[PDB]
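Consider the following assembly input.
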Amino acid sequence: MPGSLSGIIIGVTVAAVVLIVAVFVCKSLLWKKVLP
Amino acid sequence: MPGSLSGIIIGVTVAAVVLIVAVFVCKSLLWKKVLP
Amino acid sequence: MPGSLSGIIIGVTVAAVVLIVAVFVCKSLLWKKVLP
Amino acid sequence: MPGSLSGIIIGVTVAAVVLIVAVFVCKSLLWKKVLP
Amino acid sequence: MPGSLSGIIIGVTVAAVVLIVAVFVCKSLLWKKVLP
Amino acid sequence: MPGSLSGIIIGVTVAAVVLIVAVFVCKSLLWKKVLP
């Protein structure tokens, strides 16, 4: 067990920033609006 | 010599798997009745 | 004894991930608007 | 010369937390009423 | 007792590359670029 | 040069993240549709 515990906690930071991009593109897709 | 540079290799994998899920969500929100 | 700064560094990174799941499950409760 | 590698690693963990708070205040402007 | 349970962590990266070729061959069936 | 088989395995891990972003930017080039 060298110190692999340092490796899992840095991976948690990367998971949060990518999820914010997924909801942002869905709004640009709905920004088309409805033309009556 | 503390730093645990070997730790980064598991972190890069996490960004790839979450991006594939966003493609399935685009199809779920497009599936809603039939357009004649 | 009245705190532990060591516990907090790992604690703040996971908190952001669980916070996104909290608003997402609350949105599922808006489905039940039709009786079988 | 003095480095700054200590600044970016602590910086990414706090950044994700403050970004989610920015979304809730933006909806205060979308608090517009609706007439059926 | 050297085990082999630790082996699964690196195994997750191999799952990402095989999914890219799988969706690409299935997409060609919706656009068969051949004239009769 | 005598072998160094330990060197090739990192190559498959990075291949996944660079390949998915590459096809996504190339799709935006088919957008166009602008009035003078």
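Helices of chain E lie at 8-28. Ask yourself how this observation constrains the way the partners meet.
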